[PDB]
Amino acid sequence: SHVKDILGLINAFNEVKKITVDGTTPITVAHVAALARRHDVKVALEACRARVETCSSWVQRKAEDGADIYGVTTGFGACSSRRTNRLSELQESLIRCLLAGVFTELPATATRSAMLLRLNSFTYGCSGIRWEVMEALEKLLNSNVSPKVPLRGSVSDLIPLAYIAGLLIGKPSVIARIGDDVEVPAPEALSRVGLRPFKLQAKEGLALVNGTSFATAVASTVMYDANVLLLLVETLCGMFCEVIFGREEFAHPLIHKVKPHPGQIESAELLEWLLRSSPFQELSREYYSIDKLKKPKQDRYALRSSPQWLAPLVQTIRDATTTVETEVNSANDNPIIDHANDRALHGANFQGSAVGFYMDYVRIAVAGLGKLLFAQFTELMIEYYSNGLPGNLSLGPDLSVDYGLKGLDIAMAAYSSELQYLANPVTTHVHSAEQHNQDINSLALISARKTEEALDILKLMIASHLTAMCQAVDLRQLEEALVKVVENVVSTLADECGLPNDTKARLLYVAKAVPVYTYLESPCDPTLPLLLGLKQSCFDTILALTLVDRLAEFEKRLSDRLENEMTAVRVLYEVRIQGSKFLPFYRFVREELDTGVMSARREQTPQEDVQKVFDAIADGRITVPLLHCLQGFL
Amino acid sequence: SHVKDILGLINAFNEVKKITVDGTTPITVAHVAALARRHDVKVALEACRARVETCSSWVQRKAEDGADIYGVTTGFGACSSRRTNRLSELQESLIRCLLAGVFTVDELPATATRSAMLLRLNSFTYGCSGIRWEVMEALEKLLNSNVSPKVPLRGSVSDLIPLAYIAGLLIGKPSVIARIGDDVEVPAPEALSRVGLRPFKLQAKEGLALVNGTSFATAVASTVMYDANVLLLLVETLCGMFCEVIFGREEFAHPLIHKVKPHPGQIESAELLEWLLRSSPFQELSREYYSIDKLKKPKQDRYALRSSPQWLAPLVQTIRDATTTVETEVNSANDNPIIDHANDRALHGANFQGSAVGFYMDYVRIAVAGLGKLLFAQFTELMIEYYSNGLPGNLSLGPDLSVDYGLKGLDIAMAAYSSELQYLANPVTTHVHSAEQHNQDINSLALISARKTEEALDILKLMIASHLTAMCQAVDLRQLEEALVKVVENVVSTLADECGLPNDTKARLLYVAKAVPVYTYLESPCDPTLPLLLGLKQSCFDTILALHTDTLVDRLAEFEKRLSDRLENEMTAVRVLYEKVRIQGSKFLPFYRFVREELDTGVMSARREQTPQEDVQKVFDAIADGRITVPLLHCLQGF
Amino acid sequence: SHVKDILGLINAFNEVKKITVDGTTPITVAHVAALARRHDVKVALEACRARVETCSSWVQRKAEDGADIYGVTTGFGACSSRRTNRLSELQESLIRCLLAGVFTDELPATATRSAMLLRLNSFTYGCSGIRWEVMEALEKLLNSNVSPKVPLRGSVSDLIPLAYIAGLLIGKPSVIARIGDDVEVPAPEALSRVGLRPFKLQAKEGLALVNGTSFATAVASTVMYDANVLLLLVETLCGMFCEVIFGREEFAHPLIHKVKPHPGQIESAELLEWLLRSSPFQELSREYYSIDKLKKPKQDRYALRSSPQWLAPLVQTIRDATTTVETEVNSANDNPIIDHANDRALHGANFQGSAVGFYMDYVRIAVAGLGKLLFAQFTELMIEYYSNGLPGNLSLGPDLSVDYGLKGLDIAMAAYSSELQYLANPVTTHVHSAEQHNQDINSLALISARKTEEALDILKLMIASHLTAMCQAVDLRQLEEALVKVVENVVSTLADECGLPNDTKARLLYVAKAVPVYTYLESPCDPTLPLLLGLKQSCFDTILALDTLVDRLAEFEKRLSDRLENEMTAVRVLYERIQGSKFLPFYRFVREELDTGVMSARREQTPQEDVQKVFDAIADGRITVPLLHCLQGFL
């Protein structure tokens, strides 16, 4: 199951201390994301040194012998017919030419990831780069030194990679970060870490720039996030079922066996397990047993069609992860040196098309994830579709001065709207580039950036959705306690007023049946559903059988006693979640993040509450409640 | 290799005679495509009959006894609160309300309709639907009798409305029109009459069972994926033919390049290309071409060739993965509720949701746009003298280029094809509306997406037809070129002797004859301002300085005058003769031979009366009807 | 007002008999659309003849004397450096080269005839150098219904498709021509049948024939005609929507729009205020919000209330693009441009279809906006929570469990809007560097025009469904009014017969007035439905406010049960305000002229059959008759 694979990724991200780069051990998207985001994570380049030096030696010696090899004794790109013996000058003129970006930047996280991925490519021993340059890359990475790199210019990653090469050769115009607090010209940065500027040998300029390292770097953290957010969305579908009073049957194994898309079986299998012994599903069964024939037979699509919907999304995100990791673990470079067979091989491994195309697909899948969240949120906000919950999840009781999560609802539409726009492909906009030499190009970095922007929005949407669901948990729990009060007040008052058994039964059924949030604002308002039902019953008990006096007295005593006792339990409140598999999420948001039920009495704005949830998602603290919730699933 | 899988698909499409529909043998995209396109292909429903009858009687009993089951004793969609014991009228009312398409005729074609009927029939064999076996038999008979309802093109968010027309046929709705063969349209009651059927009266759940499926989206996706596989393999293969005509370096496909960047589609496409180009007579000429003035010529090829395996990689993987997804849907019970009669429950879910097909249709349309762009880039290089390594601009034979613009028209159309294709590849799946009284707040739009991908494939067929036609032109131009260069050499060689020129002059002159691209001076071989006589003049001056007399100058002047007399006549003669060989040793011989001999074409020029349309039309027709798979299979023989 | 301009376009489309082509008289999009669609419309080429022959003469002379002029003594496109004195063969080689489309699908005859018209018109300016006699042949071909069959694709904007018209004129055997609707013959037989002989191309003539924007602009012209008509139609139907939904017409108040004065906002609101002023339905709406006022919405939802703000950019986009397309229709889209007066061949790019291209992209986005408005309005009309008394799906019932009303149309509306939104992505953002990199910018105007055309097909579908639904809503509103009165009468008369106190009678009559009738039509005396539910509350209340009374109330309840349903069934059967409404022409056209009725289980015709009739009438222009009646007297 993909659920195991994603939990494996989260663990790896959390547990990795050293990333060994040795030409053989795979680097995963978790390793890359951990390097980028956790400063205590170090690179360990393992002396594959033998194959690096052989390749390096082969390239320099052949170049000096005057062998005819692209970009070592020839011009670059469309200029490949020009030959030269100016070995170092050739390489230097390439870097000069490629220092061509403009600051209107790629972040340090991306840049460091690119540095790791370039270093990794070199370990396969096809590049002809010197071992010493690799050691400098490892040292730069572990010292938190990174060039400032312009955002744009790559069609996929010559220009952005030229800034890493610029740093390594000490270009004065290249600015490097040393940690978060220091910016200095490249020569000063090299000095401060005990390095001297390199003099480029044969092929070294080209080897440093001819990779897919920036596209693949952004794609790696994109894929790590996409896996985690994917699992988070699937899991939260179960919380949605619980708070909305869904029917868990939608996740029944036979439904999905019979339409066996792997993502459909696996998401449904997770959802069946999450909901198996749910206290909230127990309430759901109670709810639909009261006036069963006046209530929906099935849930609406946002819940009931969730496994079918998630299926291609799971599969796209899983497959794209494989593709990105293949790219991470590849010699993306040209020429490829086949030193064992005494030849340089001319091809196009710099071409980031596998990554670019899959970036387009994943952005579409992320939009699909956003649409599901938006549809669920919309249902949650509308009393007609929420099975007893108040509109906008407004606690009130005075709804005229409590518009609940309406702000969050509007924002969800804005989030989804922009997300859907972002999901158009980048890959269809291929221009014939670089003197028409690059007449196909992947645009993978640009695509990766757009998928990253899409995920930023998805994070906003998940934070909002989780926050609303926590609100909804409190509201369901308050609902149960409120209904018990109403029943108790109705029962005891019927006794006191000495009403017949016929009467008491009719009134207690009303007290159990009418949704409490329809009348919470003013419980004894004669135009609201509680008293409406009560009056209906009282007339019926009169037709079926002083009795009038005892009924009028009941209605007066209820008018005096009920709202006060409802306010009491409400104020006290300001439990079923204790038995829910989603307890860790509720406990995380309420206790660890220090929040409470949302209302006019709570001073914290929706911003303040959703910001905490969002920050926990952005920095990965959300995986703790996620891993606790999933504990024991196999 | 995906290459084996696609060859398998093609074999299955050509060879199948009966599609067995039995609830356990899988139906592939090739079977669907063969049913749709080959009218000798028949459906065989295999009496799964037991579980089907158990299911339908289970549903009927439960309903009669008043069991609470969605869409059987319950209103539909957003109205599922409403209960009824009006079992047949409930189902009748669903069909009436769903007969809501409009003919703009634009319609779903018979091919997609018949495919959809097969897929619905297939879903039913899993015994989860509650449909009567006799309705299933009716579907088999309609299929085998070539009777199809006429179905409006639009209305589905994925396939209630379109499927309602098949249901409408079965119950004899007079407003539903039916095809019988290619030439007859009659009202539904008459169509049933003509094949020995009586209108059905819908039992509990039967109206819903007929309409609550992904049959149309999946029908169009099936023929889309079949075509996408074939066209993909064709594009991959023709990359090798492009290498041969453009004078590429086959090194780009070396197995080590790709082992070291091991995307499965990258390795497998490069593996195919290495095989296609091993021992190529055209690659031999390429090696010779670059050995002459080596240092004045590009060390590497441009991206459209050299980066083809890296470009193809995701395209191969998307198309292969989508085929699996679509076939999983073909072989599914897409219906709701799902009757688990063994455990006496009707399970309420959403197997009618075509999201798997919808999202993959979007991915594939993107992959197809990538295939179009690859063809457009390759075609572009071929038309431009600066990038074609000796070929004339526009692949114009001429020799008078002022009245022969060659394949320029095709070049223009290729830009028009790619442009619209890139536009089409925007996603459909991002346009989800909250539908059906906000009941369907997510919906796949799979049929809409599948239609756009089909449109994308129409354009790709056009591009492949053009590209293949151009490469056959280029084959002829390369073969004529080799012949013309040999004549220039002979004339220069013998005339050098006969004019009594020194051996160092003769050798200089013969170098020029070998090194100058013949198509740069074919228009007028002895024009003093064109590259042949340019080089000859330089060489003649250098000779005078090197051997530095009046006799030398007389003989050199004589050489120029006599070349002026003879060379054009000789060059004209070999060209005319050619219009009246290395491809014989090429793995692409079956393509060249198919286009030239079987389709009856020739080198394009001002002397050929057939227009580019007429030539490309033949190739396009062969791609459209599958005849192109014959040279594809011959070419790939032994791989 | 744009409303007046569109009415002007409609009248011209309907009334034109002869399109005058003379180099000075403007050709409008209505003229193009009428030629395309009404075959009784003829072309009158007015012998501009003198400037044409002068320009023609100039070119032939200059070419024969070996002047250096692009595409007359030089090669084409990227090959312009080649010179030749083979004047006719040069022109012939161009056509040969451009006969390069494929039949997969074809540009329709309507578009091809429009393209022939536009090319002929371009020639009248006397910049092209084409012979007068070729122009007469084009006029004759137009007037005789002869058209080449033309491949759909190949143009980046229109060399390849125009080469088919040139191919017809020179009698290329491989070019197939239509004669009327049924005859298809090779080009030389077609020419022969209308008494023409094949032209032999003179200097520049091949190029003049192919070097225009005629196909993009043809399709764009019918696109813009339809866009104007359908726009006005959607704007107008917003008023009809207000009437059936129980809208508040104040949304169209002139001060609101004076204060945010986008011209399209002012003008659509002005139209809507006029359509809704003293409406009988607005009077029903006013009544509705007066009953339990404080429990009903103070404002309408956006699909109505925000309609003039929404329509504003859409009106403006469609009007400005009409101007732009007409400027193209009336242009010398050719190259070189011959300035015979000053003896210069001017080298430019009037073949570049970019004005049309970008505007087709804009219009497609605006059409998507119109579709979205219709979708949102239709969605509200189907949902009881938002329709202010109307049944879900506009189901008549009474038994809703066997009547799902217009739910099928509702699903289809989502499908239509969805695909329409996708179609509205731009084509102009996909410019490829084409034709040996000579055409490194190109308009793609024909492709874009085709997509806008496709988007308008869907809009037609959406308008047809919406209008059908609103007619259903008219019937349901009038039936509602008749039903409430019936219930009020039955309640009143039965209160008297049971001798109920005035207090009781008053309470019960208010329930009869207040409860939306469609919430209980299914079973009027079901004790779980809103009527008897309201009646029981009032009965308990009257007992508190005041044992023989109980007897009488129990007798009222039994009598109502005997009587109410039958009285309601009778009025409904018989039925199976619009007379004072400005939308009467639309209702009458759909119900009477198209022969339809309220939708229910008892009517055999399917939703398809009803909507097809309405769609066909939109498609062929018959919809403009009720539209013009509805708007009579406006401004």
Ligand SMILES: *N[C@@H](c1ccccc1)C(F)(F)C(=O)O
């Ligand atoms: N990646 C291409 C290139 C172009 C310009 C400068 C450096 C590199 C290339 F295709 F030419 C290559 O490096 O192989």
Ligand SMILES: *N[C@@H](c1ccccc1)C(F)(F)C(=O)O
């Ligand atoms: N697919 C949905 C439906 C809606 C309207 C008519 C028939 C069917 C459904 F979700 F409600 C279902 O059938 O499950």
Ligand SMILES: *N[C@@H](c1ccccc1)C(F)(F)C(=O)O
């Ligand atoms: N439109 C261009 C052209 C190209 C090929 C054939 C005919 C015309 C042109 F720009 F070159 C022109 O005609 O001006």
